[PDB]
């Protein structure tokens, strides 16, 4: 399945066409079915072409020579293909030979706002297409969440880090177009906890699978039982949680309870039957004594003989329904229920993996919708995660070659009219000097962060609509950050990519919980996520890699951890030029505002539009996801300027 594998690729159904496809091709859509069949041929087989080899521009020209007959006779239906794929970067995206050189009148002014992964896939792809493209970028480097460290042999991520399984992920392109080395995560993750010492295999485990359970609890009691709603505020994830805990907590309780009360049961009959036991000695003793007087006792004795006997029928007979009293007893005393849900070592064990969420959403769990947190797990790549061993800034630094990039520009203020636009911007070396860029079309991709941010960073002449920023309200945007200690020695398991460490406190579980081990050089990245991660913005690096070096002696032992060369400590949320890490749905939000951000800004026709992860549905909060909004845009826009 060569032309099934390219369509897969691709992230389309390789047997049936797509709602975008039909809208283009009405007339082979609603026409013979046949021609659908040829369709999709021609279009898994030209993203074949492109897959296989993405470092060169695959033209109409060498599609239709390569095509195999009878389609190589198909001319126009080719080329219709072959056009729609190219205009919305499916094939000729990212960083390749061009065989068929720009033409040298460009059509069009286009603007885009921000120089990361978003702004830098939708520029190429406009240049491309022939148009006019100049990005404004307020840093001193492209890139925006994608940032690389890099000092001598040291490399590390500060941004991005991951890229999620290359099976669908456009990232499998762009990483063999510019060379970046990927690295499969290894499993094996130790946990240690705030006294240095491992967790057991055992209790790893454990507390793993109840981790599991209660998440699909709350899967279950969301789409299920509809449990999205209370006291009109919408639920959070972090607030069902609280909830199945407690109930756990409750049936451990009621087992408890039920048992004691079978040991009371039996203790009580014990007691009662030792009584009536000890009154039938007493009445056997009214025997072996009386009984001995008078000399028609041939038959007396034989009488007190079958009596006193008949009472002893009756007493060791107690003692045998006695013995199984004190059998079932001590069996119930012996194999008693658990006597908690989770011991409190075992609810912060629990708690790291709930700081291990809560870094994956950059967001504290209480703040992230029950019912769309995960919205949109539908659409994960298949494979393992890898991590970028030489940088991911690799990426956004390959993806800007021969782009009219204008770094320390800060753009201040965007007017569109129906008749054109004006972006201004200041020098941020010379917050006097501004600039004044004329253009048609302009290309938003600033961080859900700065469009959130009160008051604004940049102002819109006019102002954004209600339904825009009503929905750039409801969006949560987190915050995730990472210490990077550079040593000039391995003091740490070099098989191991991860490790964790437990926190003391539920309230503190994301502080330096996880480190990763992950460059050529001895480095060592240590994460603060959830409540912790804004806070911790507020120490010095030095506190911070202060207690990031106990942490690792507690582990590793002091003397076997020496004081760092080099450190870097980022702080996404104070950053102007980013405000935060990435987007997540926040409870009372949804999946639909991730399109409503995307919808273009239009006075009598289309001139404001939007791209960055938060315009993604998708493919939110995720370098992949911020590709692909930039080739959607890009796509969107040749249309309304080019057509
Ligand atoms: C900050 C951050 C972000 C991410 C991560 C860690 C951290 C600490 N990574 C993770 O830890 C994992 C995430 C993850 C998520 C999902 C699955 C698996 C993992 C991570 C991860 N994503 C991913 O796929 N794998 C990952 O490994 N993210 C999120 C991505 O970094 C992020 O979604 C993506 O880079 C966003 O790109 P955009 O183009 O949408 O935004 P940005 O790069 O900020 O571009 C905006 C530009 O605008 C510029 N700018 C601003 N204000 C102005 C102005 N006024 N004038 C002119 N220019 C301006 C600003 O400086 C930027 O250059």
Same mark, same amino acid.
């Given at each position: 399945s060569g032309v099934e594998g390219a369509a897969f690729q691709s992230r389309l159904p390789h047997d049936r066409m797509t709602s975008q496809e039909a809208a283009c091709f009405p007339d082979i859509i609603s026409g013979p079915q046949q021609t659908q069949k040829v369709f999709l041929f021609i279009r898994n087989r030209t993203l074949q072409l492109w897959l296989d080899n993405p470092k060169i521009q695959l033209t109409f020209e060498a599609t239709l020579q390569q095509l195999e007959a009878p389609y190589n006779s198909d001319t126009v239906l080719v080329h219709r293909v072959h056009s729609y794929l190219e205009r919305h970067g499916l094939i000729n995206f990212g960083i390749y030979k061009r065989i068929k050189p720009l033409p040298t009148k460009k059509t069009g002014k286009v603007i885009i706002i921000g120089s990361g992964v978003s702004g830098l896939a939708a520029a190429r792809q406009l240049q491309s297409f022939g148009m006019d493209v100049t990005l404004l970028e307020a840093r001193d480097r492209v890139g925006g969440r994608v940032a690389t460290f890099r000092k001598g042999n040291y490399v590390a991520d500060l941004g991005a880090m991951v890229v999620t399984g290359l099976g669908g992920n456009p990232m499998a392109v762009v990483s063999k177009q510019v060379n970046m080395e990927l690295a499969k995560i290894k499993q094996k993750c130790p946990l240690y906890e705030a006294n240095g010492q491992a967790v057991p295999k055992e209790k790893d485990e454990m507390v793993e699978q109840e981790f599991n359970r209660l998440l699909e609890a709350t899967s279950y009691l969301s789409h299920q039982l509809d449990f999205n709603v209370l006291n009109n505020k919408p639920v959070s994830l972090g607030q069902a949680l609280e909830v199945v805990i407690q109930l756990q907590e409750k049936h451990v309780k009621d087992e408890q309870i039920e048992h004691w009360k079978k040991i009371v049961k039996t203790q009580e009959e014990l007691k009662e039957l030792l009584n009536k036991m000890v009154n039938l000695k007493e009445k056997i003793k009214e025997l072996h004594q009386q009984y001995?007087?008078?000399?028609?006792?041939?038959?007396?004795?034989?009488?007190?003989?079958?009596?006193?006997? =008949?009472?002893? $029928?009756? @007493? %060791?007979?107690?003692?045998?329904?006695?013995?199984?009293?004190?059998? $079932? &007893? /001590?069996?119930?005393?012996?194999?008693?229920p658990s006597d908690v849900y989770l011991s409190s070592r075992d609810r912060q064990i629990l708690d790291?993996?709930?700081?291990?969420?809560?870094? =994956?959403?950059?967001?504290?769990?209480?703040?992230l919708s029950l019912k769309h947190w995960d919205q949109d797990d539908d659409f994960e790549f298949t494979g393992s995660h890898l991590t970028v061993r030489n940088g991911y800034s690799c990426v956004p630094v390959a993806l800007a070659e021969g782009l009219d990039i204008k770094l320390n520009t800060a753009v201040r203020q965007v007017r569109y009219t129906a008749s054109g636009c004006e972006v201004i911007a200041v020098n941020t070396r010379s917050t006097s000097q501004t600039f004044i860029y004329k253009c048609d079309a302009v290309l938003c991709t600033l961080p859900?962060?700065?469009?959130?941010? /009160?008051?604004?960073?940049?102002? #819109?002449?006019?102002?954004?609509?209600? *339904?825009?920023?009503?929905?750039? /309200?409801?969006?949560? #945007?987190?915050?995730?950050?990472?210490?990077?200690?550079? #040593?000039?020695?391995? #003091? *740490?398991?070099?098989?191991?990519?991860?490790?964790?460490?437990?926190?003391?406190?539920?309230?503190?579980?994301?502080? &330096?919980?996880?480190? *990763?081990?992950? @460059? $050529?050089?001895?480095?060592?990245?240590?994460?603060?996520?959830?409540?912790?991660?804004?806070?911790?913005?507020?120490?010095? %690096? %030095?506190?911070?890699?202060?207690?990031?070096?106990?942490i690792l002696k507690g582990i590793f032992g002091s003397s076997a951890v020496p004081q760092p060369k080099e450190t870097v400590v980022s702080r996404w949320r104070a %950053?102007? *030029?980013?405000?935060?890490? @990435?987007? @997540?749905?926040?409870?009372?939000?949804?999946?639909?505002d991730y399109d409503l951000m995307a919808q273009p800004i239009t006075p009598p026709i289309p001139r404001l539009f939007f791209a960055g992860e938060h315009t993604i549905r998708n493919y939110p909060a995720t370098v992949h996801g911020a590709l692909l909004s930039g080739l959607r845009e890009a796509g969107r826009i040749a249309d309304q300027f080019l057509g």
């Open positions: 001995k007087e008078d000399i028609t006792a041939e038959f007396l004795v034989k009488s007190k003989h079958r009596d006193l006997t =008949a009472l002893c $029928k009756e @007493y %060791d007979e107690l003692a045998e329904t006695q013995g199984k009293l004190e059998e $079932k &007893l /001590q069996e119930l005393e012996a194999n008693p790291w993996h709930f700081a291990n969420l809560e870094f =994956a959403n950059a967001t504290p769990l209480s703040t859900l962060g700065v469009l959130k941010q /009160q008051p604004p960073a940049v102002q #819109f002449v006019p102002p954004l609509p209600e *339904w825009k920023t009503s929905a750039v /309200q409801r969006m949560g #945007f987190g915050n995730l950050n990472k210490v990077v200690l550079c #040593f000039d020695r391995v #003091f *740490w398991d070099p098989s191991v990519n991860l490790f964790g460490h437990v926190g003391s406190t539920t309230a503190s579980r994301g502080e &330096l919980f996880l480190f *990763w081990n992950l @460059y $050529k050089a001895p480095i060592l990245l240590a994460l603060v996520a959830g409540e912790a991660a804004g806070i911790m913005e507020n120490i010095s %690096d %030095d506190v911070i890699v202060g207690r990031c070096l106990a %950053d102007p *030029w980013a405000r935060g890490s @990435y987007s @997540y749905v926040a409870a009372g939000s949804s999946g639909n």
